[PDB]
Amino acid sequence: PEIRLRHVVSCSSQDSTHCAENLLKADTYRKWRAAKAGEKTISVVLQLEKEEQIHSVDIGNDGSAFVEVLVGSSAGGAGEQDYEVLLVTSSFMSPSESRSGSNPNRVRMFGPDKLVRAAAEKRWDRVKIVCSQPYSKDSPFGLSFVRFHSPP
């Protein structure tokens, strides 16, 4: 079942139109992008409506070369050293593509086997997504969408 996202807890950088809020539902066809070109990495923390176990993760790219997903809890606050990695840094774009802007919109699905199972074993209510683009400072980058699913 698709996990429901309540609100955006924090965002390192976002556009006035392509803002973090756009990721709360994949339904929208709305994107999240950096306020500016040339930020090597950008970040958002999303709050789930309830604490849940994550089974699968779909990522719709939008100009990023790498994407990482970490999981955390709103309970007892949430520190830097507080987020567990759920999906290790995954590639969506090559240096060449990143430089030329080719295939920025690649969508990739990550099932239970491609997630780290220590983190994937537990329940969470916070979700941190980190996007990187070290190969090109020419354009704003981010995600098109993100879908989390609980176990069936």
Swiss-Prot record:
Role summary: Scaffold protein involved in DNA single-strand break repair by mediating the assembly of DNA break repair protein complexes. Negatively regulates ADP-ribosyltransferase activity of PARP1 during base-excision repair in order to prevent excessive PARP1 activity. Recognizes and binds poly-ADP-ribose chains: specifically binds auto-poly-ADP-ribosylated PARP1, limiting its activity.
Tissue distribution of the protein: Expressed in fibroblasts, retinal pigmented epithelial cells and lymphoblastoid cells (at protein level).
Name recorded for this polypeptide: DNA repair protein XRCC1
Coiled-coil stretches: none
Organism: Homo sapiens (Human)
Disease: Spinocerebellar ataxia, autosomal recessive, 26: A form of spinocerebellar ataxia, a clinically and genetically heterogeneous group of cerebellar disorders due to degeneration of the cerebellum with variable involvement of the brainstem and spinal cord. SCAR26 is a progressive disease characterized by gait and limb ataxia, loss of independent ambulation, oculomotor apraxia, and peripheral neuropathy with distal muscle weakness and areflexia.
Subcellular location(s) per record: Nucleus; Chromosome
Complexes and interactors: Homodimer. Interacts with polynucleotide kinase (PNK), DNA polymerase-beta (POLB) and DNA ligase III (LIG3). Interacts with APTX and APLF. Interacts with APEX1; the interaction is induced by SIRT1 and increases with the acetylated form of APEX1. Interacts with (poly-ADP-ribosylated) PARP1.
Phosphoserine carried by residues: 139
Entry superkingdom: Eukaryota
Full-protein interval shown: 2 to 153 of 633
Modification comment: Phosphorylation by CK2 promotes interaction with APTX and APLF. Sumoylated.
